[PDB]
Symmetry: C3
């Protein structure tokens, strides 16, 4: 299948490119701006990791992030899956964006921590781009941190701790009934100076791990942490 670019067991994430999408279909897609060439990154488990991976693909190419959608998923876990549509005019440039996103999954899963009772997710970049902006509300060109815990109360405490660690600016706070697809996540997003943003993410991680462990299992990442 010419549309197939690659598929990864990480999050059950598949990447595809439609070189010239049918106009009647395009007309029904909820995109910020229409383009003839579309890349598609679609996964069962994760939204932050795939969104941050796609941000590297946008930085590497001329593609634009035109839709981020939010399945309530993770195959029985508390989180989201994800659908990301990017738009451009060159199928080659789309394929390269999708390949770069797929080759960043092992990194952006590095601070996802899982346990039987729930999970934590952390993300950080010193310079957000268009996927982080559309998907997570990041301010493009500026530092960005994502601090998430499930069950969602843990995220509320992670958020409080992170804000009290350095003078970072809160962007939003999403929760089961506001700004998620009824996930069981409490997620603070932040901006500010890159060092402080990193400080605040790491503080939220530490208290998240302590809280989630209280169910009796050390939360585990399947790939090495990238936030340090």
């Amino acid at each position: 299948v010419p549309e197939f670019v690659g598929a990864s067991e990480i999050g059950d994430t598949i990447g595809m490119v439609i070189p010239r999408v049918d106009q009647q279909l395009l007309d029904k897609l909820h995109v910020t701006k229409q383009y003839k060439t579309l890349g598609i990154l679609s996964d069962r488990t994760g939204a932050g990791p795939q969104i941050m991976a796609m941000d590297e693909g946008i930085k590497a190419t001329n593609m634009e992030c035109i839709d981020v959608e939010w399945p309530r998923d993770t195959k029985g876990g508390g989180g989201h899956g994800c659908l990301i549509i990017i738009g451009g005019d060159d199928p080659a440039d789309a394929r390269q964006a999708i390949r770069v996103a797929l080759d960043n999954l092992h990194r952006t899963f590095g601070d996802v921590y899982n346990a039987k009772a729930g999970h934590l997710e952390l993300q950080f970049t010193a310079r957000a781009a268009g996927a982080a902006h559309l998907g997570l509300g990041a301010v493009e060109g500026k530092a960005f941190g994502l601090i998430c815990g499930c069950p969602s109360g843990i995220g509320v405490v992670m958020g409080d701790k992170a804000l009290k660690t350095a003078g970072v600016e809160p962007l939003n706070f999403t929760s089961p009934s506001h700004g998620t697809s009824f996930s069981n996540e409490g997620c603070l997003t932040i901006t500010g100076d890159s060092g402080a943003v990193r400080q605040a993410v790491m503080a939220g991680r530490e208290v998240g791990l302590k809280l989630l462990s209280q169910f009796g299992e050390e939360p585990v990442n399947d790939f090495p942490s990238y936030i340090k």
Copy 2:
């Protein structure tokens, strides 16, 4: 329990009939039109198969489809469960409709294909009826196709391929943040001539199977394909 009609392991689907529903309850239900007699079809796994099954029940009776509701479910898969309420004036007719729907499950699951990573669902009819109209936006009395893939990006490619196969008319495209219960499905619905519709659905199936297989498992239907 007089209200029980039957239960199937297929989708964990249960059918019941309330011959004369309490009016205080009926004023709390979101129905297109109130009737005193309700048929209820309720499942954990599947929305399209039950909807198309109930379409046969409507064709077979005088019952009207008055509500289709959408649990996000499939017991940890990426799809929907379903609540279908039908209404009429005769408890026996409501029961016959529910029986006909239960008896069509093995058929309407025939183009549901499952794998660890996801699933595909295809439906087709040459003449849609009231449940397909209310539930899925079909045009009654005309041909209808549903072409769905999970994770949802597979469904976007399935749909592009379907439209490029024959001149069909798209009805809608639903996706995780538009027109689903935050499901992981991308679903194209179409009408047009019955032959062109069947062509489009079959080509969507083919590319979806190829795409979903890339996770390393052949997608399996548990019942013979009907399309």
Copy 3:
């Protein structure tokens, strides 16, 4: 972690207190009323049992229920998880509320009945308090019953039977596409005299157990029934 109060394996429920929440965060929380001190009760499986357990924490303390939020969860089952935020002036009062809620989970899971196909949930109190009000629409100071079945069509029948058992007043009926987080639950809430309310909850339980058991498995509670 000073914020930690307790964690239970019942529902995967964790209880925490923030003595002095950051004001920038509080401004982003969806609460009915700002308080400096927050108690947080959060779980993967259950909403009604945590809300009813928090009602007893409220009755025991000066805390007010200021937010109830609704994960679609139960770890692949058909129900909700829950996030409950309580607010007050005194971190010790918040801790006592959370402890009382945690110590009520074994009781409020008493009439939660699970099976492979679905589950039932019943609740009862002769006097609802603020968590049952904000969370479930109960009338404060009056008896309250909750009658819920999954898959959701079982809840419609349970609710019909309940109303026809005694003269009770329906407050709401929530369903997959109305008033839930796309759960697969049909849930009737009622008020009225306490004896009539218990009669109705119990009759709803009986018919639900019979219907859910048609899938082949007796629905089981993990804790003694309290109703």
